[PDB]
Amino acid sequence: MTEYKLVVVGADGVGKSALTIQLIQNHFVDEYDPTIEDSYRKQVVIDGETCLLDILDTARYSAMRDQYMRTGEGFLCVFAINNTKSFEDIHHYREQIKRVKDSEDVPMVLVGNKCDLPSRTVDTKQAQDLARSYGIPFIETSAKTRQGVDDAFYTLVREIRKHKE
Ligand SMILES: Nc1nc2c(ncn2[C@@H]2O[C@H](COP(=O)(O)OP(=O)(O)O)[C@@H](O)[C@H]2O)c(=O)[nH]1
Ligand SMILES: [Mg+2]
């Protein structure tokens, strides 16, 4: 039973918790304490392959945190489409991941969340441009409506598979 270790990173309030819960528990969480960091596991079938997702929802001493940075195989870098600052913060996250992994080639997906909202300040092109700049996928999601939620997580799994060959 093959296991994939994922880490969800990004600025506070982007929807890291909501996304993880939406994937795992299949519901939208209205309020989840921002200070809580925890791991969640689920057995899933991705592209005909049954596997175990092991995801850390970051809030940012914890040995669990340390282990996931060390052993985690792929990172969701999350911003919100209505939060310019959060998009601006993305590069910070990437540099942290690069350092921890000691590698330019770490499996990652840029996720633009809250795309159910009209109040959009980060346009598709901007995020695609950044994604292409890093050579990673960009995926637009809504935790509230489930739009692209499995896609974001499954894409990252596919990024990991590439790295493993
Ligand atoms: N409209 C909308 N609200 C969202 C979405 N994702 C999260 N939220 C809300 O944004 C707030 C912060 O989300 P949370 O998951 O706690 O973000 P975190 O701090 O990054 O873990 C909460 O009020 C969530 O219900 C989404 O896709 N659409
Ligand atoms: Mg949270």
mmCIF file of C-alpha atoms and ligand atoms in Angstrom:
data_model
loop_
_atom_site.group_PDB
_atom_site.id
_atom_site.type_symbol
_atom_site.label_atom_id
_atom_site.label_comp_id
_atom_site.label_asym_id
_atom_site.label_seq_id
_atom_site.Cartn_x
_atom_site.Cartn_y
_atom_site.Cartn_z
ATOM 1 C CA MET A 1 0.000 0.000 0.000
ATOM 2 C CA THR A 2 1.810 3.051 -1.416
ATOM 3 C CA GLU A 3 1.767 6.204 0.714
ATOM 4 C CA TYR A 4 2.177 9.860 -0.354
ATOM 5 C CA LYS A 5 3.205 12.490 2.190
ATOM 6 C CA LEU A 6 1.868 15.927 1.431
ATOM 7 C CA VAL A 7 2.314 19.292 3.067
ATOM 8 C CA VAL A 8 -0.016 22.211 2.662
ATOM 9 C CA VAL A 9 1.604 25.612 2.974
ATOM 10 C CA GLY A 10 0.601 29.199 2.476
ATOM 11 C CA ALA A 11 -0.426 32.396 4.111
ATOM 12 C CA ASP A 12 -2.883 32.538 6.913
ATOM 13 C CA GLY A 13 -6.462 32.594 5.731
ATOM 14 C CA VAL A 14 -6.013 31.178 2.260
ATOM 15 C CA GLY A 15 -7.959 28.024 2.962
ATOM 16 C CA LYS A 16 -5.332 25.431 3.788
ATOM 17 C CA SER A 17 -7.476 23.922 6.490
ATOM 18 C CA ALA A 18 -10.693 24.114 4.548
ATOM 19 C CA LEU A 19 -9.093 22.426 1.574
ATOM 20 C CA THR A 20 -7.659 19.585 3.534
ATOM 21 C CA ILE A 21 -10.937 18.978 5.310
ATOM 22 C CA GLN A 22 -12.850 19.224 2.069
ATOM 23 C CA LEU A 23 -10.640 16.553 0.635
ATOM 24 C CA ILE A 24 -10.675 14.299 3.630
ATOM 25 C CA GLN A 25 -14.033 14.792 5.206
ATOM 26 C CA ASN A 26 -15.988 15.890 2.160
ATOM 27 C CA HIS A 27 -17.424 19.014 3.763
ATOM 28 C CA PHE A 28 -16.722 22.709 3.980
ATOM 29 C CA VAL A 29 -15.580 23.981 7.322
ATOM 30 C CA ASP A 30 -16.697 27.430 8.176
ATOM 31 C CA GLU A 31 -14.319 28.021 11.040
ATOM 32 C CA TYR A 32 -11.218 26.057 11.919
ATOM 33 C CA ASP A 33 -8.708 27.561 14.415
ATOM 34 C CA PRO A 34 -5.792 29.062 12.442
ATOM 35 C CA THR A 35 -3.256 28.002 14.973
ATOM 36 C CA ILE A 36 -3.978 24.315 14.543
ATOM 37 C CA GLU A 37 -1.569 22.175 12.559
ATOM 38 C CA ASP A 38 -2.373 18.444 12.227
ATOM 39 C CA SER A 39 -2.035 15.492 9.901
ATOM 40 C CA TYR A 40 -4.822 13.760 8.089
ATOM 41 C CA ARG A 41 -4.850 10.438 6.349
ATOM 42 C CA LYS A 42 -7.148 8.886 3.761
ATOM 43 C CA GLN A 43 -7.100 5.940 1.372
ATOM 44 C CA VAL A 44 -7.875 7.053 -2.116
ATOM 45 C CA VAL A 45 -7.918 5.759 -5.651
ATOM 46 C CA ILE A 46 -5.955 8.002 -7.998
ATOM 47 C CA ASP A 47 -5.880 7.071 -11.647
ATOM 48 C CA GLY A 48 -6.772 3.474 -10.797
ATOM 49 C CA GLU A 49 -4.206 3.213 -8.080
ATOM 50 C CA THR A 50 -5.259 2.807 -4.507
ATOM 51 C CA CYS A 51 -3.023 4.723 -2.197
ATOM 52 C CA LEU A 52 -2.763 6.478 1.118
ATOM 53 C CA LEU A 53 -2.649 10.252 1.384
ATOM 54 C CA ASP A 54 -0.875 11.565 4.419
ATOM 55 C CA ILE A 55 -1.334 15.345 4.657
ATOM 56 C CA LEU A 56 -0.062 17.984 6.972
ATOM 57 C CA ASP A 57 -2.160 21.122 7.218
ATOM 58 C CA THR A 58 0.254 23.756 8.311
ATOM 59 C CA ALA A 59 -0.287 26.599 10.636
ATOM 60 C CA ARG A 60 3.343 27.447 11.436
ATOM 61 C CA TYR A 61 8.865 22.761 18.350
ATOM 62 C CA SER A 62 6.999 19.959 16.703
ATOM 63 C CA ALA A 63 8.613 16.721 15.689
ATOM 64 C CA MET A 64 5.676 15.938 13.431
ATOM 65 C CA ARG A 65 6.254 19.195 11.609
ATOM 66 C CA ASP A 66 9.915 18.391 11.296
ATOM 67 C CA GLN A 67 9.223 14.941 9.969
ATOM 68 C CA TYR A 68 6.882 16.171 7.256
ATOM 69 C CA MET A 69 9.322 18.749 6.057
ATOM 70 C CA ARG A 70 12.014 16.085 6.005
ATOM 71 C CA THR A 71 10.059 13.226 4.609
ATOM 72 C CA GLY A 72 7.143 14.838 2.804
ATOM 73 C CA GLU A 73 7.162 14.275 -0.811
ATOM 74 C CA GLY A 74 5.160 17.133 -2.206
ATOM 75 C CA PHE A 75 3.845 20.570 -1.242
ATOM 76 C CA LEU A 76 0.663 22.477 -2.049
ATOM 77 C CA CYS A 77 1.530 26.168 -2.138
ATOM 78 C CA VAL A 78 -1.742 27.972 -1.572
ATOM 79 C CA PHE A 79 -2.900 31.537 -2.079
ATOM 80 C CA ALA A 80 -6.349 33.089 -2.425
ATOM 81 C CA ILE A 81 -7.539 34.718 -5.674
ATOM 82 C CA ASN A 82 -8.965 37.619 -3.645
ATOM 83 C CA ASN A 83 -5.847 38.081 -1.533
ATOM 84 C CA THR A 84 -2.969 39.787 -3.362
ATOM 85 C CA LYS A 85 -0.692 39.670 -0.279
ATOM 86 C CA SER A 86 -1.072 35.894 -0.091
ATOM 87 C CA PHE A 87 0.020 35.583 -3.725
ATOM 88 C CA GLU A 88 2.987 37.867 -3.049
ATOM 89 C CA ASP A 89 3.933 35.551 -0.123
ATOM 90 C CA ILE A 90 4.176 32.513 -2.432
ATOM 91 C CA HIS A 91 7.847 32.941 -3.268
ATOM 92 C CA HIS A 92 8.710 32.837 0.464
ATOM 93 C CA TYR A 93 7.090 29.389 0.751
ATOM 94 C CA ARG A 94 8.910 28.058 -2.302
ATOM 95 C CA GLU A 95 12.338 29.186 -1.008
ATOM 96 C CA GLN A 96 11.612 27.446 2.335
ATOM 97 C CA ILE A 97 10.717 24.208 0.550
ATOM 98 C CA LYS A 98 13.820 24.423 -1.672
ATOM 99 C CA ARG A 99 16.060 24.819 1.384
ATOM 100 C CA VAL A 100 14.437 21.994 3.361
ATOM 101 C CA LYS A 101 14.706 19.623 0.380
ATOM 102 C CA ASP A 102 18.117 20.898 -0.835
ATOM 103 C CA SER A 103 16.709 20.706 -4.395
ATOM 104 C CA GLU A 104 15.375 22.795 -7.300
ATOM 105 C CA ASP A 105 13.117 19.866 -8.246
ATOM 106 C CA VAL A 106 10.624 19.301 -5.428
ATOM 107 C CA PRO A 107 7.061 18.178 -6.352
ATOM 108 C CA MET A 108 4.782 21.173 -5.887
ATOM 109 C CA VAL A 109 1.495 22.602 -7.104
ATOM 110 C CA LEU A 110 0.523 26.266 -7.016
ATOM 111 C CA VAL A 111 -3.110 26.408 -5.856
ATOM 112 C CA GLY A 112 -5.329 29.512 -6.211
ATOM 113 C CA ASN A 113 -8.213 29.025 -3.754
ATOM 114 C CA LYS A 114 -11.551 30.810 -3.157
ATOM 115 C CA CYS A 115 -12.317 31.002 -6.885
ATOM 116 C CA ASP A 116 -16.018 30.920 -6.004
ATOM 117 C CA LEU A 117 -15.638 34.571 -4.987
ATOM 118 C CA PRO A 118 -16.211 37.504 -7.381
ATOM 119 C CA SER A 119 -13.776 39.791 -5.506
ATOM 120 C CA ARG A 120 -10.810 38.615 -7.603
ATOM 121 C CA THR A 121 -7.486 40.499 -7.532
ATOM 122 C CA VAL A 122 -5.100 37.780 -8.768
ATOM 123 C CA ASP A 123 -5.890 36.960 -12.339
ATOM 124 C CA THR A 124 -5.427 33.513 -13.911
ATOM 125 C CA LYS A 125 -2.588 34.678 -16.167
ATOM 126 C CA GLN A 126 -0.538 36.060 -13.213
ATOM 127 C CA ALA A 127 -0.648 32.696 -11.428
ATOM 128 C CA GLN A 128 0.037 30.716 -14.627
ATOM 129 C CA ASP A 129 3.039 33.008 -15.261
ATOM 130 C CA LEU A 130 4.454 32.326 -11.800
ATOM 131 C CA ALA A 131 3.739 28.578 -12.101
ATOM 132 C CA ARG A 132 5.540 28.454 -15.443
ATOM 133 C CA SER A 133 8.351 30.486 -13.800
ATOM 134 C CA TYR A 134 8.760 27.639 -11.300
ATOM 135 C CA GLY A 135 7.903 24.782 -13.700
ATOM 136 C CA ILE A 136 5.048 23.525 -11.490
ATOM 137 C CA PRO A 137 1.260 23.052 -12.188
ATOM 138 C CA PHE A 138 -1.204 25.759 -11.272
ATOM 139 C CA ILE A 139 -4.684 24.674 -10.161
ATOM 140 C CA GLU A 140 -7.618 26.899 -9.279
ATOM 141 C CA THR A 141 -9.793 25.592 -6.432
ATOM 142 C CA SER A 142 -12.775 26.291 -4.223
ATOM 143 C CA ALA A 143 -12.886 24.675 -0.778
ATOM 144 C CA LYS A 144 -16.454 25.957 -0.520
ATOM 145 C CA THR A 145 -17.715 24.258 -3.696
ATOM 146 C CA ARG A 146 -15.144 21.486 -4.103
ATOM 147 C CA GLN A 147 -14.023 22.928 -7.407
ATOM 148 C CA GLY A 148 -10.593 21.507 -8.191
ATOM 149 C CA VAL A 149 -10.011 20.127 -4.765
ATOM 150 C CA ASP A 150 -9.316 16.491 -5.645
ATOM 151 C CA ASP A 151 -7.529 17.858 -8.744
ATOM 152 C CA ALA A 152 -5.105 19.949 -6.616
ATOM 153 C CA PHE A 153 -4.203 16.982 -4.397
ATOM 154 C CA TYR A 154 -4.180 14.388 -7.216
ATOM 155 C CA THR A 155 -2.068 16.632 -9.390
ATOM 156 C CA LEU A 156 0.551 16.799 -6.639
ATOM 157 C CA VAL A 157 0.472 13.014 -6.379
ATOM 158 C CA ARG A 158 1.214 12.897 -10.133
ATOM 159 C CA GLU A 159 4.084 15.351 -9.628
ATOM 160 C CA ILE A 160 5.493 12.943 -7.001
ATOM 161 C CA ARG A 161 5.160 9.962 -9.376
ATOM 162 C CA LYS A 162 7.253 11.855 -11.989
ATOM 163 C CA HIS A 163 9.952 12.533 -9.367
ATOM 164 C CA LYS A 164 10.023 8.830 -8.442
ATOM 165 C CA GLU A 165 11.089 7.554 -11.878
HETATM 166 N N1 LIG B 1 -15.560 31.666 -0.256
HETATM 167 C C1 LIG B 1 -14.600 30.811 0.145
HETATM 168 N N2 LIG B 1 -14.184 30.862 1.445
HETATM 169 C C2 LIG B 1 -13.185 30.006 1.837
HETATM 170 C C3 LIG B 1 -12.590 29.065 0.870
HETATM 171 N N3 LIG B 1 -11.645 28.404 1.577
HETATM 172 C C4 LIG B 1 -11.618 28.842 2.847
HETATM 173 N N4 LIG B 1 -12.545 29.820 2.992
HETATM 174 C C5 LIG B 1 -12.823 30.599 4.212
HETATM 175 O O1 LIG B 1 -11.679 31.383 4.465
HETATM 176 C C6 LIG B 1 -11.402 31.439 5.889
HETATM 177 C C7 LIG B 1 -10.012 30.921 6.282
HETATM 178 O O2 LIG B 1 -9.831 29.572 5.783
HETATM 179 P P1 LIG B 1 -8.927 28.464 6.517
HETATM 180 O O3 LIG B 1 -9.222 27.141 5.887
HETATM 181 O O4 LIG B 1 -9.068 28.524 8.016
HETATM 182 O O5 LIG B 1 -7.513 29.066 5.986
HETATM 183 P P2 LIG B 1 -6.045 28.771 6.594
HETATM 184 O O6 LIG B 1 -5.885 29.823 7.658
HETATM 185 O O7 LIG B 1 -5.207 29.040 5.420
HETATM 186 O O8 LIG B 1 -6.023 27.317 7.121
HETATM 187 C C8 LIG B 1 -12.539 30.665 6.536
HETATM 188 O O9 LIG B 1 -13.518 31.657 6.840
HETATM 189 C C9 LIG B 1 -13.008 29.704 5.437
HETATM 190 O O10 LIG B 1 -14.389 29.239 5.499
HETATM 191 C C10 LIG B 1 -13.148 29.060 -0.517
HETATM 192 O O11 LIG B 1 -12.731 28.304 -1.444
HETATM 193 N N5 LIG B 1 -14.105 29.973 -0.778
HETATM 194 MG MG MG B 2 -5.701 26.498 9.034
#
